[PDB]
Each structure stands twice: as structure tokens, then as C-alpha cells.
Structure 1
Amino acid sequence: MITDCFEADIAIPSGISRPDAAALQRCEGRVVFLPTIRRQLALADVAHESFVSGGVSPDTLGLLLAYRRRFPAVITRVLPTRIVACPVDLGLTHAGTVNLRNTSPVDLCNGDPVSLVPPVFEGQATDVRLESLDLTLRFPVPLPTPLAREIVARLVARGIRDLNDLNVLYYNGARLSLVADVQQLASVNTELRSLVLNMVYSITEGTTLILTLIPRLLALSAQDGYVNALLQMQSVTREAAQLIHPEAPMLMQDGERRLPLYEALVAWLAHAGQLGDILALAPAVRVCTFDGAAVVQSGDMAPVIRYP
């Protein structure tokens, strides 16, 4: 119960109005960013006034950047005197199953990892405010990982337009758009530096062999409908072959003992497939409904089994 559960206890103060206190009874399946793993904390360390720096509360793209400096935890039960949350990383429960709540507009599936994202969507940024205490609780949004990478991708691309539309998405035929918002340039700089260092290190000498195969793909996309759909209608490589004639050098330095493409894959995987984990946080949570259904709708709870 130290290893199985871990009851990190957020204390509730004395003076809270009964309309504000009963507003916390609808805060069941949430995500609370614990700074440490103390067994006794306060709402001020949980609320957004803990998140704010000196004079500056950052934007949504920066609001990711101190989630991953903290410990996400899910509220287990809202008592009148305290709020109990088990941290995700240490131990889930006795049996190891906690319930979240879809504050998403998006329906989940079983077995898919669930990433939690700041409130970026339109008509969605709902922060339960304590009027009796002047505290806001910016509850993040649990999302599917095929969305939660694109939503980070639209925000990072929006900041780099602003250094010289984009905020519209789709998911299973549901049109949805996120909040267009001005971004602090200090937040964009650590993001853009995190792109390039994972992009420069992802290039190896054997990748020039792969580059030669680009006109073979357009020779292949004229016959395979799978390749014709794979590239895109607006892909770069379809445009990067009509102006580009790639070639490989003849010999390799010590090219007898080393593998050109096998070294190309491992350096690619360690930096380019790894790159989505560095932008967002890791989806350490998936949903395994035991007996309910295969699709978990919005507003409903969902059972959670930890995710390696």
C-alpha cells in the first residue's frame, strides 16, 4: 500500500463555500500534477498558481513543458476534508486499476495508450475555479496517441510560422478544431532546438543509400495503390524527385566491417521515432475495459492498466 497504492493526500482548507465544495465532487477522474511525492500536500501546490513562474504563466505549448517536470496523479476519491490521488509512476492501486474520465470530445478504444494534453480545444478550456479561495485547476485532457502527436505537431508548426488553416483537425470523420493562440517565443526555442538535435543526429552516411531510392518510389507509386496512397497528395518526396537526382558515393571508409543501412536504422529509431516522446510526455496509461465495451465514449470513466 506503499508499493501497491500510494495515498498522496491533498488537504482541503477550512473556508470553502458549499457551492464550491460540492463543485469538487464532480472532479473524480482527473489528472493532478504533483511536484513531489509527499504524503501531505495543499491545493495551492496543485492549482495553477503553483504552475506560474515569476510574473509569467506560460501558454499551452509551454504548459506541456513543466508537466514532464512533475508527477501526474489521478484523484481517487474526493472526501470533504481531503483529496486522495495515487501517483501513476509508483503504484496504481491494490489491484492496479484506477478510473479516469473522458474530458475529451474524443471516444477511446481498448488497449490504446492514452496521452494527457493541456486544454487546447475550442469550447473545451474548462478550469474548475475555486471562488472561495481564488484558485483554478487546469485539468488536462486524456487523448488518443494518434491525435496527441498531431496536436503537438500543429502547435510546434504554428510557432515557426511566427518566426518568418493549421489549427483544424479530423478524427474518425469528426471535424474538430483547437484554439488558435499566440505563443511565447521562449517556449518555441526549446521546442525547435529539440527538433533539430533529434534531426541532425538522425542522419548517417548509410542514409544516402536510401536517398537514391526516391525515383524508384515514384516508379512504384504509379502501379501500387498502396504506395500511391502512402506518400501523400502533398508529400515532399513526390516534389523532391523532380528537382533532385540523388546518388551514392562509390566506396565507404572501412566499408568491409560495418553495415551501412543497419547503422542507418538504429540512429533513425533512436532520434526520429523517439522524437514524439520528447515533444509531449509519455503515454504511460492505456485502457482495458474488462467487461464494458470496446469503445469508451466522452464523459464516461474508463479502467486503466499501466503501460510499459
Structure 2
Amino acid sequence: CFEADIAIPSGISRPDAAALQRCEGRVVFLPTIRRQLALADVAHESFVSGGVSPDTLGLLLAYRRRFPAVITRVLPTRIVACPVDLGLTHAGTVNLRNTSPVDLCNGDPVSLVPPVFEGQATDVRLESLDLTLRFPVPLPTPLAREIVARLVARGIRDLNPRTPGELPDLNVLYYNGARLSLVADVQQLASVNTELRSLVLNMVYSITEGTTLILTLIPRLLALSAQDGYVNALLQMQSVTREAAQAPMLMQDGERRLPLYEALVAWLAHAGQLGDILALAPAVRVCTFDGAAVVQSGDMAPVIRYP
């Protein structure tokens, strides 16, 4: 585990000692690797920057440059945390707590998302030690990648107004059913802006010279549309692909460079990496020993290493 401890610094509200008991299996973001550390850098008051608190995109950027840690065992003197970034060498598969409305799967990669849900705030309050605690919500990673694209684009609509007030909310989610509504309260600009620029600048490099030949086959896409099932379902209705349909540009130097093969490389370099440069890295994977295929809300799932 390469054991790391966090002590109980000063006093105890006597029911709130039991509040630390039911947080077993949650995640602490501690911005270090320590053998002992105070509880002051733990809470959300440390997540608050100079003067201002981060938004749910800034908390992504706040959870960027800190280190997650697993609650292992809860003492009245200390709390032993295992440093996820290094000390994931656990054949004992140190256990986590699922605090999420989604019943997951077996075999999901699990990445951490700030509490942004309408009813799972994960707000526990300490008044003897005046601190506020937001636990991250562990979620499956495609469902995690369906969230971060919404919240930045919702903040993309925070730059430009123009349109009438009835906008698509980006606030109805879909997992097999299960209509989810999240919170849209505040959108800090710099958390939107720096997230928007890497969405711009990576999509710059992901276009290359041999990429341009693919753009010719855009009318070839709709030729498969009215003659099969798979393509017509692949072609989205709310897509620009159905909108843009309504050429080599020769410039041929040398022609032994494999121009089409080189196109799919650098496109995958930056447009292939769009979930992980915006959000947190997944290192938690669902692995139950008993053959249980799903893990209930509130359960203690065994946790294995990087996916």
C-alpha cells in the first residue's frame, strides 16, 4: 500500500465521528505523498482557490493537479489512505464505495467526477472542524465521457447568447432508461476557456495532409444510407453530416509517403485523445470475485489497477 496516514487533528463532534465511519471506501484528494498530513488540505475549502470556488469544470481542473486516495481503515486517531497514483499494487484489491445512482456493470473502467448530480450532492458537514466535504462520484467511463462534453458545451453557450431562450438543456442523460438531470448554476469562464482551447488546439493537429482525401467521400456516406441498416443507424439525425451534403487538389509531391495511412495516425493523436485531456484519468476497474455481474448503489466493490 505504501501506507499514508491522515490524523484526526483537533476534536470531534460525537455523531460526526460516525459520519467518518460511513465514508469508508470513498476518495480523498490530497495534493501530496505524505507519511502524515493535516486534514486542512483535504476538504473543499482547500479546493476553493484564491477568493473563488471552482465550477464543476474548474473542479475537474482542480482534481487535475491533486492526488486521489482510498479510505482503507478508519481509526478515531487517524485515517489510513492508500496513494492511488503509486500504491495500487494490491492483489488484495483495496475496496471502494460506489456512491452513484447508476448500477454499473462488471468490467467497467471507473473514473472520478465531481458531484454535479441533482440529488447526490455527497455533502457532509463538520462544524467542530469547520470544513465542507464533496466526495467525487465514481462512474463508468463512457458515461463519464458523456458528461464532460455536455458541461463544456453548456459553457460554450455561456460565451454566446443570439438564439432564443429555449435552448437544448444538455441536462437529460440516457443509460438504458434512467432520465438524469444535473445542476446548471454557475459557469466560471477560465475553466471553460482553457478547456475550450485544448478542444480547439488538439483538433487543429488532428487534421493532416492526407486527411483531406477522406473529405471527398462525404457524399459516399449517404449512398450507404438508403440501402442498409447499420449505416443509417450510424448516421445521426442531429448531425452536420446530413447537413453538409447540400477534389484531390493534386499538389502531388513524391507520392511515396503513404498519405492516407499517415492521416489516421495524427488524427488519433489528438482527436483520439479527447476524453482524458479534458477529464481525469481512469485507473479504477470493476472486478468482483464472486461472479456478481453488477455492483449496487452503496456497495463495496473490489478495485483493480489501470485499464
Q: For the superposition of Structure 1 and Structure 2, which TM-score range results when normalised by the shorter chain?
A: over 0.9
What pairs up with 1:144-293 in 2 under 5 angstroms?
144-164=140-160, 165-242=169-246, 248-293=247-292
CA contact (8 A) 2:171 2:180 kept: no
Whole-angstrom distance in 2 between the partners of 1:18 and 1:174: 38
Aligned partner of residue 303 in structure 2, secondary structure: strand
* Contact kept in structure 1, 2:90 and 2:304, CA below 8 Å: no
Equivalence for 1:91: 87
CA deviation after TM superposition for structure 1 residue 292, in Å: 4.4
Per the TM alignment, residue 83 of structure 1 is displaced from its structure 2 partner at its CA by: 0.6
Distance 2:272 2:105 in 1: 23
Unaligned residue ranges in structure 2 (runs of 5+): 161-168
Q: Which has the higher strand share?
A: 1
Q: Is contact 2:69-2:84 (8 Å) kept?
A: yes
Secondary structure, counterpart of 2:64 in structure 1: coil
Q: Give, in angstroms, the shift of residue 14 of structure 1.
A: 3.5
After superposition, the C-alpha distances for 1:212-248 in whole angstroms (9 at most, x for unaligned) are: 1111110101112100000112111111111xxxxx3
Alpha-carbon deviation of 1:59?
Answer: 1.0
Task: Give me the CA root mean square deviation.
Answer: 1.3
Structure 1 position 186, deviation (Å): 1.4
Distance in 1, Cα, partners of 2:154 & 2:192: 9
Structure 2 distance, partners of 1:141, 1:292, is 24
Secondary structure at 2:15's aligned position in 1?
A: helix
90 and 32 in structure 1: CA distance in 2 versus 1, 3 angstrom threshold: same
Report the alpha carbon displacement of residue 264 of structure 1 after superposing the two structures with TM: 0.8
Cα distance in 2 for residues equivalent to 1:106 and 1:255 = 54
Secondary structure in 2 matching 1:83: strand
Distance of 2:176 and 2:267 partners within structure 1: 30
C-alpha deviation, 1:26, in angstroms: 0.4
Once the two structures are superposed, residues 126-181 of structure 1 have per-residue CA deviations (whole angstroms, 9 ceiling, x without a partner) of 22111211111110000011111111011001011111121111111111111112
SS for the counterpart of 1:170 is coil
Q: In 1, are the aligned partners of 2:106 and 2:293 still within 8 Å (CA)?
A: yes
Mapped contact 1:34–1:71 kept (Cα < 8 A): yes
What is the distance in 1 between the residues matched to 2:66 and 2:282? Answer: 14
d(CA) in 1 for partners of 2:6 and 2:119?
Answer: 29
Post-superposition offset of 1:306? 0.3
Checking the alignment, whether the CA contact within 8 Å between 2:58 and 2:191 is kept in structure 1 is yes
For residue 286 of structure 1, report the CA deviation from its aligned partner: 0.4
Measure the CA separation in 2 of the matches of 1:292 and 1:28. 23
Report deviation, 1:255. 3.7
Give 1:92 shift: 2.5
1:58-96 deviation line (CA, Å, top 9, x unaligned): 111100102121111110011111111101121225525
* Match of residue 113 from structure 1: 109
- Percent identical among aligned pairs is 100
Whether the 8 Å contact between 1:20 and 1:132 is mirrored in structure 2 is: no
Do the aligned partners of 1:6 and 1:93 also contact (CA within 8 Å) in 2?
Answer: no
Shift >4 Å, 4+ stretches? none
Q: Is 1:127–1:138's contact at 8 Å kept on the other side of the alignment?
A: yes
Greater shift in the superposed pair: 256-265 or 148-157: 256-265
Q: Is the 8 A contact 1:86 1:93 kept in 2?
A: no
